Every structure is written in structure tokens, then in C-alpha cells.
Amino acid sequence: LNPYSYEALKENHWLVSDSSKKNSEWTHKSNAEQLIAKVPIIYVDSNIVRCIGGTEINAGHPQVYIQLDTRKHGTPQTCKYCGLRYAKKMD
Amino acid sequence: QKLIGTNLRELRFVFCQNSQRSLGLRNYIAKNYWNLKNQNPNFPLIVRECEEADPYIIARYQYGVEKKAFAANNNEAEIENIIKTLVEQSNKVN
Amino acid sequence: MLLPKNAIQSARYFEIQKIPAKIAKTANEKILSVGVAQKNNIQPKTVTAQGQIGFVQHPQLDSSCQYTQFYTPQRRDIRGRVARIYIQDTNHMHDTPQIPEGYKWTLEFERQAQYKTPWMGWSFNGDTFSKRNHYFCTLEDAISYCKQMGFGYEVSFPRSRYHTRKSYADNMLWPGHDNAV
Amino acid sequence: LNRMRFITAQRDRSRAPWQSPKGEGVFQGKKLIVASNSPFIDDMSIR
Amino acid sequence: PLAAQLAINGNRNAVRYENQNRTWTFNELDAHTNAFAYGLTELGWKAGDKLLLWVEKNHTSEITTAQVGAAKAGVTLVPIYAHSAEELEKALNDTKAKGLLLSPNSKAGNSKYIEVVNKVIPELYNTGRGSTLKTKFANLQHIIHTGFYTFPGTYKFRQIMVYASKNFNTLTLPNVELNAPLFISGNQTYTLKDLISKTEENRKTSKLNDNTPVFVTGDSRSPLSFSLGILNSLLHGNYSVYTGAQDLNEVGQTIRFYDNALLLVDGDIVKATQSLKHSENFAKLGGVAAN
Amino acid sequence: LFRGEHALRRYPTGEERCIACKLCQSACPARAITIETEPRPDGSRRTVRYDIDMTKCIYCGFCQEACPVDAIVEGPNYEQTAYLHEDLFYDKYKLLENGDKWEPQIARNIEYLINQPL
Amino acid sequence: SRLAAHRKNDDNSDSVPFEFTPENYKEIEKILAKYPLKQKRSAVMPLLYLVQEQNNNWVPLSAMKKIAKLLEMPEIDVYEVATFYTMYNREPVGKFHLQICGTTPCQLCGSREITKAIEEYTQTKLGHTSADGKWTLEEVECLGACSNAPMIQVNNKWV
Amino acid sequence: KQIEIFIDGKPAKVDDSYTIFQACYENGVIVPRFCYHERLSVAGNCRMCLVEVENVPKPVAACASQVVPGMKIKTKSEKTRIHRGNVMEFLLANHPLDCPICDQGGECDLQDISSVYGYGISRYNEYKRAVEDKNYGPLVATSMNRCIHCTRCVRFATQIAGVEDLGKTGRGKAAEIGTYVEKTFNTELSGNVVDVCPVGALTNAPYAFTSRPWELKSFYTSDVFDTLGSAIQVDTRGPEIMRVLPRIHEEINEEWISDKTRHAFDGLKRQRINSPMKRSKDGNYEDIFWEEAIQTISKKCLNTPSDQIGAIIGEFADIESITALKDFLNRLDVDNFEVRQHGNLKVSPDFRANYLMNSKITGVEDADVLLLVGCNPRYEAPVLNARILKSTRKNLKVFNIGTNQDLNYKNVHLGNSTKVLKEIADGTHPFAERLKKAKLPMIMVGASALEREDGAELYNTLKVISNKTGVISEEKSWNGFNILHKEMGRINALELGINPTSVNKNAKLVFILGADNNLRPEDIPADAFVVYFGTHGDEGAYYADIILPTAAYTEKNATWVNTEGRVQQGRLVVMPPGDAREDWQIIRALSEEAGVPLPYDSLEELRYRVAELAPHLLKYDYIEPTIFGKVALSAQQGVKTTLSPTPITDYIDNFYMTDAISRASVTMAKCSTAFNHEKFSNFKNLAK
Numbered sequence A: 001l002n003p004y005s006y007e008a009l010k011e012n013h014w015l016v017s018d019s020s021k022k023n024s025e026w027t028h029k030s031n032a033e034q035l036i037a038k039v040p041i042i043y044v045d046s047n048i049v050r051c052i053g054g055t056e057i058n059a060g061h062p063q064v065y066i067q068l069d070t071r072k073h074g075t076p077q078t079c080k081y082c083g084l085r086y087a088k089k090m091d
Numbered sequence B: 001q002k003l004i005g006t007n008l009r010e011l012r013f014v015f016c017q018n019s020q021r022s023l024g025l026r027n028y029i030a031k032n033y034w035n036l037k038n039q040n041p042n043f044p045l046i047v048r049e050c051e052e053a054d055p056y057i058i059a060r061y062q063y064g065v066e067k068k069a070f071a072a073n074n075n076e077a078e079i080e081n082i083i084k085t086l087v088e089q090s091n092k093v094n
Numbered sequence C: 001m002l003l004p005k006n007a008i009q010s011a012r013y014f015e016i017q018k019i020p021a022k023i024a025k026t027a028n029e030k031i032l033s034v035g036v037a038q039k040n041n042i043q044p045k046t047v048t049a050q051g052q053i054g055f056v057q058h059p060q061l062d063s064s065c066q067y068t069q070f071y072t073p074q075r076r077d078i079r080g081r082v083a084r085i086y087i088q089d090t091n092h093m094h095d096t097p098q099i100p101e102g103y104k105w106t107l108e109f110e111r112q113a114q115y116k117t118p119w120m121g122w123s124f125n126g127d128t129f130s131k132r133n134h135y136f137c138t139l140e141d142a143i144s145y146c147k148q149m150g151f152g153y154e155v156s157f158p159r160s161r162y163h164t165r166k167s168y169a170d171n172m173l174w175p176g177h178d179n180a181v
Numbered sequence D: 001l002n003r004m005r006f007i008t009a010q011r012d013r014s015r016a017p018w019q020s021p022k023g024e025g026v027f028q029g030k031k032l033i034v035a036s037n038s039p040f041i042d043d044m045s046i047r
Numbered sequence E: 001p002l003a004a005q006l007a008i009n010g011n012r013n014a015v016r017y018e019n020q021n022r023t024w025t026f027n028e029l030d031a032h033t034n035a036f037a038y039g040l041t042e043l044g045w046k047a048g049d050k051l052l053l054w055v056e057k058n059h060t061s062e063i064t065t066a067q068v069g070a071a072k073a074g075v076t077l078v079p080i081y082a083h084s085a086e087e088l089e090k091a092l093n094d095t096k097a098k099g100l101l102l103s104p105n106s107k108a109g110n111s112k113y114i115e116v117v118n119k120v121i122p123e124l125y126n127t128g129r130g131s132t133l134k135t136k137f138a139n140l141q142h143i144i145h146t147g148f149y150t151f152p153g154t155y156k157f158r159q160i161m162v163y164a165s166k167n168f169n170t171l172t173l174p175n176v177e178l179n180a181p182l183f184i185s186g187n188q189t190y191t192l193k194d195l196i197s198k199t200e201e202n203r204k205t206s207k208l209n210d211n212t213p214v215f216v217t218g219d220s221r222s223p224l225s226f227s228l229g230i231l232n233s234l235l236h237g238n239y240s241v242y243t244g245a246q247d248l249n250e251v252g253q254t255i256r257f258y259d260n261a262l263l264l265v266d267g268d269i270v271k272a273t274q275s276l277k278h279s280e281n282f283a284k285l286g287g288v289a290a291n
Numbered sequence F: 001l002f003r004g005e006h007a008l009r010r011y012p013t014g015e016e017r018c019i020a021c022k023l024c025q026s027a028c029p030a031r032a033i034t035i036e037t038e039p040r041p042d043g044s045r046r047t048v049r050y051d052i053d054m055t056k057c058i059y060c061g062f063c064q065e066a067c068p069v070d071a072i073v074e075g076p077n078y079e080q081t082a083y084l085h086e087d088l089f090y091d092k093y094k095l096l097e098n099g100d101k102w103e104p105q106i107a108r109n110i111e112y113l114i115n116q117p118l
Numbered sequence G: 001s002r003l004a005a006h007r008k009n010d011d012n013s014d015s016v017p018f019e020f021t022p023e024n025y026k027e028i029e030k031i032l033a034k035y036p037l038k039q040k041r042s043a044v045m046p047l048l049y050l051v052q053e054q055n056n057n058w059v060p061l062s063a064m065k066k067i068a069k070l071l072e073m074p075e076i077d078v079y080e081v082a083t084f085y086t087m088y089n090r091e092p093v094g095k096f097h098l099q100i101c102g103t104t105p106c107q108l109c110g111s112r113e114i115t116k117a118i119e120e121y122t123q124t125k126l127g128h129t130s131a132d133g134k135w136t137l138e139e140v141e142c143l144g145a146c147s148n149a150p151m152i153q154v155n156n157k158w159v
Numbered sequence H: 001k002q003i004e005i006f007i008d009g010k011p012a013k014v015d016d017s018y019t020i021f022q023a024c025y026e027n028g029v030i031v032p033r034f035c036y037h038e039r040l041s042v043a044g045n046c047r048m049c050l051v052e053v054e055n056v057p058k059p060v061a062a063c064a065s066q067v068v069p070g071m072k073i074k075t076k077s078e079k080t081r082i083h084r085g086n087v088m089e090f091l092l093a094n095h096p097l098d099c100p101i102c103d104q105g106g107e108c109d110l111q112d113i114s115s116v117y118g119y120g121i122s123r124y125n126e127y128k129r130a131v132e133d134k135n136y137g138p139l140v141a142t143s144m145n146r147c148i149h150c151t152r153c154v155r156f157a158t159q160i161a162g163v164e165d166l167g168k169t170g171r172g173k174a175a176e177i178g179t180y181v182e183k184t185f186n187t188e189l190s191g192n193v194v195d196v197c198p199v200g201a202l203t204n205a206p207y208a209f210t211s212r213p214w215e216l217k218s219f220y221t222s223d224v225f226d227t228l229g230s231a232i233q234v235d236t237r238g239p240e241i242m243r244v245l246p247r248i249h250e251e252i253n254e255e256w257i258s259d260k261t262r263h264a265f266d267g268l269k270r271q272r273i274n275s276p277m278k279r280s281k282d283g284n285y286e287d288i289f290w291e292e293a294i295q296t297i298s299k300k301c302l303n304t305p306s307d308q309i310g311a312i313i314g315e316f317a318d319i320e321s322i323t324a325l326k327d328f329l330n331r332l333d334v335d336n337f338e339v340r341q342h343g344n345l346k347v348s349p350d351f352r353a354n355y356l357m358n359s360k361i362t363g364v365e366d367a368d369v370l371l372l373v374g375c376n377p378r379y380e381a382p383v384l385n386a387r388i389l390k391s392t393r394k395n396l397k398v399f400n401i402g403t404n405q406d407l408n409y410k411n412v413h414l415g416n417s418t419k420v421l422k423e424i425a426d427g428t429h430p431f432a433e434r435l436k437k438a439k440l441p442m443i444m445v446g447a448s449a450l451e452r453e454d455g456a457e458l459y460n461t462l463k464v465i466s467n468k469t470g471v472i473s474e475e476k477s478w479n480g481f482n483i484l485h486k487e488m489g490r491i492n493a494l495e496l497g498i499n500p501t502s503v504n505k506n507a508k509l510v511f512i513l514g515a516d517n518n519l520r521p522e523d524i525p526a527d528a529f530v531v532y533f534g535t536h537g538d539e540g541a542y543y544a545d546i547i548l549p550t551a552a553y554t555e556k557n558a559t560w561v562n563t564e565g566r567v568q569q570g571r572l573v574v575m576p577p578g579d580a581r582e583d584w585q586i587i588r589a590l591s592e593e594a595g596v597p598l599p600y601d602s603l604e605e606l607r608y609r610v611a612e613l614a615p616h617l618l619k620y621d622y623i624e625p626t627i628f629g630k631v632a633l634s635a636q637q638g639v640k641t642t643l644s645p646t647p648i649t650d651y652i653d654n655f656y657m658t659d660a661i662s663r664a665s666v667t668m669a670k671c672s673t674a675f676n677h678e679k680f681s682n683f684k685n686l687a688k
Ligand code: SF4
Pocket: F006, F027, F028, F029, F030, F031, F032, F033, F052, F056, F057, F058, F059, F060, F061, F062, F063, F064, F074
């Protein structure tokens, strides 16, 4: 799994990936990547999921909507404001 | 005209393309460029045209030495004489 | 940004439009005297917003630049610098800015040393004169300011879209007869 | 004490110095032969 | 002989290249092959001139186009299986080939094809731009590589190709002669008529009907692969699918869609593959043949 | 509403709330905030350098007001006396540490502030 | 008729073959003759209908590319037509593609009761296809025979 | 026909061809828009330009409505305000709340129009539309939830470029603009897609998450990666450069730039030489002072006889640097400015007409037939390729002699060998009659063909063909003979009069002025001493006994002459990195130390010397006409005119890697690895 391979670049949006997630500790001066990677994929029945980054409006990020009806079934989608990743509960 | 290559290192003609002050040099170049080139195959004969530019024949002899001749309102015979003098003066220059 | 044609016909206005011809003073300039003469003969005689040929004018350190304030004991490099006069148009990213641009001539100075300090990586400028651009309503005013302050100036004239016929009917066009070759 | 790393990174963000060869190196005529340091793979050359 | 399918129905698909994912109709195949033939003729190729084939399996489209164009132009092709510069030089000296088409990125031993070619012919390195080759062989005028990069003394396949114009084509294509040699495999030479006879015999033996899509795995340079592949499609209007270096697994996935479809199995491909992951994909293979 | 010492918060999951929109940098009247951002390897829009010059900053509160995700918050700490001028050049490390330490009280105040409009 | 893009399916990959039968080629020739010689771009819809008839009532991506190649038009145009028009099934359907009208006339006449009865008999929900590839339920708009409501259509053919 | 209309009661006069939007723009009243683009077709999708007309009950779309006599337009009326508010509310409905995270935060015309014309508060309180993202490659980042379905991207792709990939697939609110299948948008002009897209749905991926518009300072300069030359804007936040954009220059740039010139500036950010260096016999490089480097170079120059001194001209050489080098070599008695013998351009620098495009970049819009010889406009000067596409769609027939590249427009491939040229010259080829029939024909020849060993013969053949077929016609006052160059440095050298054919076979002292292409060990003798003026160490820094850092095009205030003869001024954006010095200053210091001081100490005096050599270079952004075109291009009697039987090829292999800056760039490497395999094809796309 070479981070500079064409397959890896295409899968990671043409960005060099860090599997260990340790380089961010220096690059962005935080372990937030490691912390967020621990949260598992949240499975949502609906095709579209609403995220506000909290329990109430103004307590998180602006209300956003994520399409879980991916052209490939079951592909998780990550929220842009927070790293939470949601996937459709295919059955 | 056959000894230009050995006598000089470069000839240049800077003039205007639509001015009577340059008409003479313009016509002389248009008529004799190919003759001079055939006489001296590999010698550099540069031609530069700029509007409202003073006619000038620049002869570069050797070791970065150049002589500039003001050829304004000069008949083709005068241009021939000036070029001949520039070519002949190479020995005196070096 | 464009007063009516020949609306102003003052001697001062004509002087502002006209650009001086250089006089060889330095030894290098005297050696290149032919070059100075050629430059004087070739460069445009007057500057107007209708001009189309760019040019560079040397600073005129003369009695005309007496109004400059940037010649002080501590700083002696601002005067005699060369500026750039051009119209800054809106970026290609967007077409309808909240604050539209292109209605004024911008005068700019090339930036000097710019270095990031070690302690925090903050950007620092060796000179504080060329941080902000200057703005003028007319190229005549910009050139007058340059002459008054003793700055040399390059002028690059604007370029705009060529007007072309536009019509929704052009979407539907009959190609022609099939047998046509 | 690790100010050098931060300073070098800040300098490289805008301009990264070229790492010149050091020590003995192979010569082909008047040329020093060094392998390319580009992490990216030359897929067209390889296949 | 090579335009019956165009006369009948040129819109029908002609050949498929699964490895490089490109499918050609009869019209497109004819256009490409005619372009190759015109390019060779313009370069000066004549009837009987020899072109060496040193292209690996992956370049199935290039192999097929070169074969058909050589057949159209009456140029004989000699496949060469050389993993060493000694073998390459021996083959070149023995054949006196006018041209050598090869795959540069292919690896032979510890060196690539382009490196071996340069080693055999050092003159290519210093050859002038647009200058004819002055080599020891005295006849290897043309060197062509099917690669992305360009090297001195070599020309790319697309650069060699020349698409003739409808009203500005001064070139001429000699009429295809059946008896003219086309392939020189080993010490045996196959003519176009003999290849056609081989195609007919193989079809009769394998019960290969018109609508049975043929699959070819491995190198397409073999005379049998040429007979049962592009040649079969151009003669009987069949549908050929080349898998190139793809193993039995990947061949199978393509195979599943096709029904009652003949498979040609390369020995090299068989040894490389370990075992069939999904034997169900071959449940409707119809018939199986071996090179 | 007291504006004390600047700090950077995180979501309950531990992810940073700061997305490099630079709204706080632009609104800072004193030009005391410097932000540089590069895409994170996972692809998040996160800053690589977030500096606040505490000596150049006027504790107005414009930064937290303009923050759209409540990333930068001027928490209640005011006993931030420093003996060295360099100690007042707060960096991303310092701001994140302040947020981690002072999250309880900051969150308690933010609860009431958010509930007031309701 | 769900997504506005290509669904990643193993049975609808680019490697799937598709070839028109000689009868389909003759029909295509007739269609082209009916349309202007230069305006071959107008034969997309008849070509798609022929593809559906030839296949199991759906248009493969390979078939769409073949149509584009035959019509000398961009494949994106064929993609746009297929996605815009809902009568083209871009994915395989069941043996019976039931299409129950749901517009106000049919709704007044009792379309909901008929839909519930169909669901009960077929042991499947609306829109979803039955476990076995036999039934596929869909809700459609006014089919035309409002005065004869409630109504259904099968395979876009029989009302 | 002039027609009188009223805008807010203000009389105005416009011809009937004008639309409402065009009349408003001419009269100075601005109208919001999202989908109307000047260079694209007319569409009425967004309907944000609705205005009020007294006699028209319905709102009228200004963009797609022609003016009518006596029209009473009320753009400031309450009805117009309500129309704008309604359209803006509909647009913002379903629009994601991504302003903080969107890269177009400060350059969003949607935000600006919502602030200026639309209402200040929204009523839509419901679930919004959600659209999956798409992968278009490493050059364009897609966030399709922000798409407004204005089809500007589709129109640009289909019209400006030949690529036909984007389309509005679907119906209703579920419609999605983009490729139906998953594929990358790898067109050479993909960068301009981001510019045309107005709502940040498509953004610059390399520039993504970097900075904001309000914290950038912009400088107008000229492109150098292509010999065509392009008017570009460089945005910088302090020392760092970012977001190179095009700027309107219809004569040369026509608002578009190529991906190379848009994303190759990253090369300047690494592998930069920042100090004079010297290499030991063992090969160990060590940094030294400018004084030491100049002193050793001057000592070598004094010791070395002028006979065995030579120079190589680099790719990015400028007028000032080449003039200084020429003067220094002349004062040292050195006259040969080439050391490479493998490939030299076969063209005389006497007349500008014989090595410049006689017909300007706009000459394609005037020619009826255009014949290319060893040229690939798609890879070299892609903007020129787009212009040729426009010309061939309006009225122009394109023929090609050489390789059959995947041009965006149909072309007639005559051949690839010199047999076609021989036949055309002899007159037996039907294309000779075709040219004679055609009016204002044009011949474009790439510099590689003239750089061939038989370049002189090919050049003479082209001259005779042009003269015989009327490409140079006095009655038509037309000169269609053109040469497309590949080296701005070579163009500058030809302008200054340096002979490209003068090659020093054996040179003991070589001065390499930033040359990195075509260098091979055989060119440099083993015993020679090499001084390399350069800015990158990819190549030429390994052949150098001494290395001198120089300035780049974004760091040097110099002059550049493009392929068509236009002389532009490249301006200083940031100073040279580290201890780098301007190349002309380095040459001046070297001359003074060696004892042959040059007569210029500043840019003004150096430009006076440039005026001495060739005055026309002092008229910036202007093409000086020449009246010696026919004389220069006239075919002489007795010339060789003997061509070789070999294919005519194109030098470009990897479009994203052509020069040292591109090779050092990272974005270009990503583009190469993401596009080379998808774009490589030995066959021709018969579809187009
Ligand atoms: S308190 Fe005000 S001045 Fe200080 S950092 Fe925050 S916004 Fe800037």
C-alpha cells in the first residue's frame, strides 16, 4: 500500500495518505485525526442524513446534509465540518 | 563585399520602415541583402525595423568593438560608400 | 475615469500628458548616447488613456519633484523608484463582485525583501513603502502624481473583451442540406 | 532546541533548497549521476 | 478478402481488447490497419520486407493492427522470442529485417527491451534527429517501440501510422496476394492462404459457428492465435476478444458474460495462474482449445 | 460573556472544531491572528498553523463572534501573566491546551449563551 | 430509475458485451431512413427501445455506448437521454414490471387499495423488487386512461 | 440599426443586435447573472437577470432577450427587486451551508448577489438536496451539493474545448451535472472549468484549503511555460505565490490559460539553487561566496583562449540576460553561442519575418486553410488549439503533415514523411492546387522540424512552397508563413540576433545559461570547465563545475518576446530566493572582475543597450510590423532542398513535464501519474 501509488492517490483524492495518522501530530499540531478515527461508521436508515455536530442548533457546526445513496452501495461519507462518517444501513 | 566575413564580425541595419529619412537605407537593404548574403554565406547581417527610428549601420569588428554610422537622408551610393569604409577600416581597428 | 474629449485643454494638462526626453548625464548613458536617442525617438510622445503601446519612463529628479515627502535622512530609497500604472480588473473567478474593480488606475511598487522570521514564522517586509497600492481616478492624475513625487513609471494599458453579437437564436441553427458537400 | 526543524519547514513552504550531492559520486563524462529523489512512480516508464 | 465484413455489415463489433478496454468495429479496425499499411508504404516498405515482432502480450491491439497491416501491405512478419541481447542480435543477423517493432518497457532478464536494443545497436544513442540508421546489419532501417516515451533512433507506433485522406491520398496499396508470406514462425513460413486454411480447419474441428465469440489468451503473435482471432473475425465475421496477460481468473470474469464461447489457452498463462477462484464462470464455455 | 484567554475547542468526539475559513483572522481588528492551512492526509480542512499574538490582540471578542463553529473561544481565564515576551506568542499547541483544560467552564457558559435566544 | 448516475454493478460493467441482431440492424436502418440523413442524433430513443426489446427489458451501459458509436454522437448525450426519460430501465427488472398509476384520478378511484392488494399478493413492497426476479412494483403518473381508473401497466406495453 | 431605449428613464442608443444585458452593461448599469457567460452560448436556466419592462407583463430574461424600439426598462423598480429576491430565494433553497469550508468564500458571486439584490433572510426550513461527490482528477475538486445547475461547465467543455464529458443527467431536482460514468476530466484546459463555475461546486484542488481572496496581492505578468505567451495574474500572500489565473487579453490569451501554466508555478517552491556552489573532482558540492565564484570564473576566462570558449542558451533566458551574455562574450572575442551539435535550430536571425509568425495569433481566425508541419497545438500552446477549434468550427480547414495527434477538431492527415513535402514542392500533390484555390492560407511549422538535421532543407522547401502557392501574397497583403517555437530563450536569442547555427565543436570553457533540455554527457567535453547560471538542480547542475543561482520569471523584471513577435514585460512578484542574483547583474559583475566592464549598471542602461541592438523591444505589448517579409522568405536558386525519408515527429512526450520547473513541480507529477496512462494511445480517435 504505497501512499504515492496511483490507486492510493485515486482513493484518497490525489493526496498522500498517512496510515499511522502520526504525521498530523507535527503537521497540524494535534492528534485530532487519531481521536476521530476511533469513532466507527454510523449506520443510518435514510438515504440522506442531517448533521449539526451536536444535540441542538448553535451547539455544533451549521446544519448540513449528506447523501448516503452512493453510486456504490454502502460507501461511507464523511461530514465536512466534523469527521463523523455515515453509511446507509443496506438490507 | 567578398571580404566582409573576415573583416567584420557582424553587420546590423537599424532603421524605420515608413520614413523618408530611412528610405535610402531601406531600399539599399531590400535590393542588396541577398547579394551580400551570397557573397558572404555565414556572415551575420541583421536587419531591424522600428517606426520613427534613426537610420544606423552598426559594424562590429572584433573584441566587442563597434562603429555606428548615421545613414539618414543618404542615397544608395552613400550607403555603399559608408559600408565600404566600414569594411575597409577593419584592418585599422585591428 | 474618462472626461469628455478635449474637455480640458490647459497647459498644465498638456504638460502632464507629455513625457520628457532623457538627457544623457551618466558616463554609461553618454557611452550609450545612441541608445538614448533611439529610445527618445521611438517612445510615445504623449500619454493618454487611448494609448496602446506600453513604455517605461525614468524618474525625473528635477525641480518638478520638489513636492515629495519620502526623502528623509533615515530613508533615501523611496524617491526615484519605478512604479507600475495599470487597471486592475476583477479576478476571473467571479463576474459580479460586491465591490467591483476596474474603475480606477492602480499604481504599484515592486515589493522588496519579504522574509519569514524564525521565532514564529511571521512575514516581514524589509520596506514598508510598497505594501499597499495607490489608486487614482485618471491616468493623467496618476502620471501627475508620479512627476510631482519624482517616481519613474511604467504604464501598461488595459485590455478588454471584444464585443460580439449575442442571441439565443444562435443555439438553433439549420446545418444545411444533407447532400451538401 | 528543535527550532531548526520548524525554521527549515517554514523556509521550505516557500522555497526548498536543492540537496546537492556530497562525497564521492559516479561520473559519466562531465556529469554526476544521481538517482531521482521524486517519491512519485514513473508508471509510463515502468509499464 | 479482408473487406467482406465491411461490405456485409461494417457497424457490427469486430474485436475486443479486454486488457486495454477498447472495442473496435469492422470499420474502425479497417481504418487503423489501412493507416498502418499506408504508413509503412510511405516509409518505403515493399512486398517481402521483413519486420520483427518483439512486443509482449499486453500490447494485443498493437500486435493485431501490425499483423493485419502487414498482411494488407504484403510485408512479412517474424515474431522473435529473445530474452538476451545475444539472441536478439543473432535473430537480426539471420533475418536481415528491414524493421523491428518492439515493446520497450518489457523486461528481459535484468534489462528492458529498449536497453537491449540500444546495447545491440549503440549507434542509436548518437543518431541524428531525422537521420537514417547506419547500423552494422545494414538493413535494419526502421526501429519502432510501443511506449509512451521517445528514444533516439526510434519512432512511435502512432508516429508511424498514417491515416490516408479521402481526396488527398497519393499513396498506393498493393493488392493483397494470398500466396505472399505473412508470418515466419520458427523455421516454417505461413502464407495468407495457408492461414485461411488453418482457420477453416480449426473452425471445423472445434464446431466454431459464426455466432460463437472466440477468446484468445496470451500472446496474439502465434500463428494459431492469429488464425482463430482477428483473421477469423475478418473472414467469417465472428467476434474475437483478446485478454493478453490476464490470468484465468480475470479471463473468467469477462468470459461469464459471453455464452458458448471458445477459449484459446496459452501455456504460459496456465503456469502463471495458480487455480480457478470461481469455476462457475466457465460453466458455459462451450468449447476449449489449446495452442 | 467575559472575554479572558483565547482557546481552541474540540467536538465531543475529539475532532477539532476549527475549519480554516479565516473569518476570525479577517475580523480581528488588530491583525493578531495568523492562519495557514493545508489539507490533512485524511482530507479534512484543518489548519497547519494557528497563531494569536496576545500582545498585539485587543480582547474585543470579534474572533469568537465571527467563528461559525465556536472553535475559537475567549474563555474566562485572565491570570495569564507572562515573564517573557515570547510566552505571549500563543501557538496552536497553547490554544488547544487551553481549550482542553478549560472546556468544562467554557462549555457551561456556552450552554447558557446558546439557550438565551431560545 | 433511482439514481442519476451509473450504479456500480458487476453485471453492468463496461466489459458486458452487447450486439444488435440483424433484425435490429434492419430496424435501425429503417429508423435512420425515416429521420433526416444528417440528423442521425434523433434516433437515440428508438435505439434505446430496440435495446430494451433485445435485452431483458433494460439498457446496459455497453449498449448505450454502442448506440452512441453507431449514431456518431457523444456517449454523454445518450447517458443524458437515458437518465432523463424514465421508461428506460437502466438496471435489470423482474419478469413483470408492474406500474400502478398514482395520480389524483386513480387515487380517487382507489389506487391505494389496489396497490395494497398487489403488495399483499406479491409479498413485496412498493418500488422494491421481489426476492425472486419475478415481480417489480413501481408507482407512475397518469397513464392516460383516467376514466378507466384504477389502472396498471406491465412492461410499458399492456394496460 | 441604432435604436433608442430607456433604462430607468435614461435615454440610450444601441443597435438592434444588442441584448438587454449587453445594453445595460454598455450603459453602465450592472445586472446579476449566474449562467450567462460572454464567451459561452446563451442559456436562460438560472433566470437571475429578470428585469421589468413596462409593456411586458412577464419578467424578461435580460441575458437572452434582444432590445426593442421604445423599450422601457425599470431595473430599479420594486417589481425588479421582488423578481431578484424570488430567484435568489429559489437558488439558495437546497444550497448547503458550506461558506466556511468552501474555497470560494470571498469570490462567490452568489454570496455577492444575495447580499446586494436578494432578501436578507430565508424561509426554507426543510431537508435540502444532497448529491454525491465526483472524482475529476487531481486538478478539480468537486462538491456537487453547491452546484446550481447553470451548465456553464458543460457549455465550456463542449464549446471552448473539444472534450465532451459533462452533461446534465437526470430530471427534476434530482438532476446532476457531470459525467454519468466515473471518469476524470483530463482536458488540458481543465483549470478554466473552475473559473467558469461560479458557485464553488468545482474548485482548484492543488489550491484547495490554502488561503482566502481578501488576503492576496495580485500582479499582472506574462506566462513563460509556453512560447505563445499568456497574460496571467499572480496572487501572493507575502513571499508565497499561489493561484495563478488568466486575465483578459483577447489578442493572445483570449481569457484562457493551459493547465501547465496554471499549475507549474509549484516548481519554483523547491529544488531551488540559493547560493553559488563549486564541485570538487570527487563530486562534492560546496557553497562559496559570490566574490570567490566570480573571481575563479574570471581567472578561467582570462586563462582560456577565446577560441575554445562557448555558450548554451537556456529555455527561460530573457532579453536582458541574453544581451549581457552576448556583450560579455563579444568583449572576450567569443562569437559561438552554441555547444550542442546534436540538435540546432536551422533558421537565420537576420529578419524577424523568417523566424516569427508573420500572421499573428489572430491569423487563424482569418485563414481559410491551415497546414501544420510537425506541430501539436494541443500539447504546445493549448490556448492556440482552442482558437484553432473556434476557427475550424466557423470557417477553416486543417491539414497535418506529421504525427496524427488527438486534436479536438477534425483534420486531414496528409502524411508523416518528407515525401509529402517533396510532392507539394514539385506541384504534383493535389494540396498545391488546394492551396492555390484557397485564399489566405497559413503554414504553421513547429521548431522541431527546423531543428532536424535537414532543417535548412525543410525550411527552404517550405519557403518555395509558400511562394509558389501564394502563402506570401502581395495582392492579398498576406503572409501566412509561421513558425511555432518551443523555447522562449531561443526566441529572445533570435530577436537579439544570435545565430543558432554557430556551434563550437570543441569548447574548453562552457557557459550554460540555464539550459536543462537536450543536455547529454557527449555535448560537454570531459576536460571542459562548466559555469551554469540556473535556478533548479534537476539538470545542468550536474555538468557544472560552478553553479550560479539566477532569478525566475516571477522574480526577474525583464522582457520576453513571444512566438508571434509580441514583446511583453515580465514583472517582479517576489525577489529571488536566498542569495540568488539577477543573471544580467551576475554577467555584469563577472565582466567587471574579468576586466571588460559593460556600459550598463542598471536596468535602464541595460535597456538602452537593448535599444541600441534592436529598438523595437522597447515598445512593450506590441508587435512591430516588418516590410521585408517577402525578401526574407523568398526562395533562392541553387539551394539544397534535399529532404530525408524519415517521419516528422513532435518533441513533447509528457505535456506536464517539459521544463525544469515542471519537472520539479509536485502538482505536475500528480497530473502526470493521473493522466499519462489514460491519455496514452497509439491509435487515433476516429470519433472526432
Ligand atoms: S480578542 Fe479580538 S484582537 Fe484578540 S485575537 Fe480575538 S479577535 Fe483578535
